[PDB]
Amino acid sequence: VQAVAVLKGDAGVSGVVKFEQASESEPTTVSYEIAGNSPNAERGFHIFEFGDATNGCVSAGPHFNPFKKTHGAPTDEVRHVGDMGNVKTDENGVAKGSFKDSLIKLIGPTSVVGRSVVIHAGQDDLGKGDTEESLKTGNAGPRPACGVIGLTN
Amino acid sequence: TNDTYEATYAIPMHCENCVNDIKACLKNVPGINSLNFDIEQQIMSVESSVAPSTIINTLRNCGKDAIIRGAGKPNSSAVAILETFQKYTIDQKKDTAVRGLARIVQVGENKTLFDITVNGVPEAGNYHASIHEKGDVSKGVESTGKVWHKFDEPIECFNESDLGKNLYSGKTFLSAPLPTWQLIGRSFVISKSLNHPENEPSSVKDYSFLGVIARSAGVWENNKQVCACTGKTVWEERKDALA
Ligand SMILES: [Zn+2]
Ligand SMILES: [Zn+2]
Numbered sequence: 001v002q003a004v005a006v007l008k009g010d011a012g013v014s015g016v017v018k019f020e021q022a023s024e025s026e027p028t029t030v031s032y033e034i035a036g037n038s039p040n041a042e043r044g045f046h047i048f049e050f051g052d053a054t055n056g057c058v059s060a061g062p063h064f065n066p067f068k069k070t071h072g073a074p075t076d077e078v079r080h081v082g083d084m085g086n087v088k089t090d091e092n093g094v095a096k097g098s099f100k101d102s103l104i105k106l107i108g109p110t111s112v113v114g115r116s117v118v119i120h121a122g123q124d125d126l127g128k129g130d131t132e133e134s135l136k137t138g139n140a141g142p143r144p145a146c147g148v149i150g151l152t153n
Numbered sequence: 154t155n156d157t158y159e160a161t162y163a164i165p166m167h168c169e170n171c172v173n174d175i176k177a178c179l180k181n182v183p184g185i186n187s188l189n190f191d192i193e194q195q196i197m198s199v200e201s202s203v204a205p206s207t208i209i210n211t212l213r214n215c216g217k218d219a220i221i222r223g224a225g226k227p228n229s230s231a232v233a234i235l236e237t238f239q240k241y242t243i244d245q246k247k248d249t250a251v252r253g254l255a256r257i258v259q260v261g262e263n264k265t266l267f268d269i270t271v272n273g274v275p276e277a278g279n280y281h282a283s284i285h286e287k288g289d290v291s292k293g294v295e296s297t298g299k300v301w302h303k304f305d306e307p308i309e310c311f312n313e314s315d316l317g318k319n320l321y322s323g324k325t326f327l328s329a330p331l332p333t334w335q336l337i338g339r340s341f342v343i344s345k346s347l348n349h350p351e352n353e354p355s356s357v358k359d360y361s362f363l364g365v366i367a368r369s370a371g372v373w374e375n376n377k378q379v380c381a382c383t384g385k386t387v388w389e390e391r392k393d394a395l396a
Contacts, residue, residue: 003338004289005365010249016291050375051337051367052232054254055220057380059232061370113288114231114337114368122383141383148365150288151338152296 001106002153005117009145012036015095017117019149024107030084031098034119036145037089044124044140047082047104051116051148060118060146063137066110070135073126074101081110083138086124095119118146156202156260156328157186159372160224162209164217166195178215182207196222198372204268204326205256227371229259229333233341235271235362238293242352243275243360245317252362255282255341256369259333267327269308271343273316276360279307280323280345284331288340288365297340297363302331308343336366 003019015034021027037043049061063071064082072079081103087095105111120140127135166172172190175197179185182203189198197219199208205221212219224230235253237244253271260266269282286298306327314320344361347353 004291006290049368050370051365052369053234053367054232054256054369058377059370059375061375061377114366116367120381137381139381141381143381148288148367149338150290150340150365152287152289 002151003106003113003149004152005147005149007034007117007119007145007147011121011144013119013144015119015145017147017149019104019106019112021106024105027100027102028104028106029098029100030104032087032095034087034095034145035093037093037095037119039089039091039093041089042086042123043089043095044120044122044138045084045087046080046118046120046124046140047084047112047149048116048118048146049082051114053116053146057143060116064112064115071127071138073128074099076127079103079127082112082115085126087119113149113151116146116148118143120144154202156264156266157200158202158225158229158258158260158266159198159200160205160208160221161196161198161372162219162221163196164212164219166190166192166197174215175212175217178212178217179208182211202260204266204324205258206268206270206324223370223372223374224256225258225371227374228368230369230371231257231333231337231366232369233257233364233366235341235343235364237360237362238290239355239357241275241347241357241360242354245275250362253343255343255364255366257333257336257366263330263332265329265331265333265336267304267329268324269327269343270322270324271308271310272322273314273320274310274322274360275320276345276348277311277321278345278348280310280343282308282325282327282341282343284336284366285340285342285363288338290340290363290365294342294344294359294361294363297342301339302329304329337368339366340364341366
């Protein structure tokens with residue numbers, strides 16, 4: 001099963017994200033490339049519960065958290081399944097990389113197909129901060145571009 | 154009339170007659186089974202077989218401004234914002250890309266409603282909605298693969314648009330035996346054959362806008378109110394004023 005999300009937004013940031021997953025049990029492989037970002041920096045990268053943008057951030061809901069846990073890093077055990085941490089950007093504001101995850105799935109009751117992918121304007125504190133806030137969004141601030149995860153191939 | 158679904162809309166209702174006017178405003182709208190006013194959280198739960206647009210618009214033409222916040226059992230509703238993926242000679246220079254919205258709600262074990270709205274197309278006429286195989290909009294309608302389901306009721310766009318004095322709009326309330334689970338992840342496409350494809354500097358044939366069918370929060374399923382942001386600098390603001 002393959003999915004893909006196209007990131008747009010009136011911020012000059014844009015890009016495409018691809019998902020590959022052979023079976024529900026096996027891990028999903030995330031691949032991404034995003035330009036328009038600040039040069040040499042880290043930017044949050046989350047999957048929101050809904051894809052509905054009929055009212056922007058608000059209609060999208062919080063970070064896709066099917067297992068009712070707090071915000072964290074992709075490394076940590078306690079994390080929203082939609083926590084992809086931070087993506088690094090080169091000297092041209094382009095973030096390009098990939099990774100595998102065992103929580104994110106394109107199949108089954110926790111499928112992220114139809115939910116949205118967003119990249120923020122700030123760095124995600126991975127929940128390692130003080131505030132309750134840190135354990136919710138991670139302080140990645142504004143979100144310059146997003147997209148809905150759709151079936152493809 | 155099983156095609157009923159529950160929806161919740163936020164509308165201010167903390168005045169002396171607020172509610173009564175809403176009650177009044179919808180009193181003649183056929184298709185509404187019930188209205189519930191949770192005055193505390195200022196939310197109106199609505200049971201009906203009506204298009205969300207109908208509810209939202211009937212109220213607008215009455216000054217009351219409502220904002221839908223949820224619709225249906227969890228995982229029974231979807232939304233698709235329809236945008237163009239290229240600029241046409243007939244579009245306006247300073248326009249954005251949104252052209253319409255498809256709000257989907259499942260009302261039967263195998264039957265969903267489609268509240269299709271188009272507001273502001275530059276070329277009047279009859280547009281056609283259809284759902285495509287893929288939810289890949291990387292290369293516009295091309296990257297979406299073959300048709301998955303073609304609706305038949307056209308979307309008549311001849312009404313005047315509130316956006317431009319010479320733009321057009323339309324709406325159509327379809328119904329199909331397509332369950333929500335097969336819809337999400339795919340793409341909703343609305344297109345019409347251009348009257349003068351000759352004038353487009355490209356192999357472009359149809360004027361089309363689409364979007365990936367996304368998941369929408371069901372009734373009482375999402376209570377996100379605000380969201381993160383920063384800035385509001387005065388020194389930053391000055392620099393913008395003197396660019
Ligand atoms: Zn999170
Ligand atoms: Zn009050």
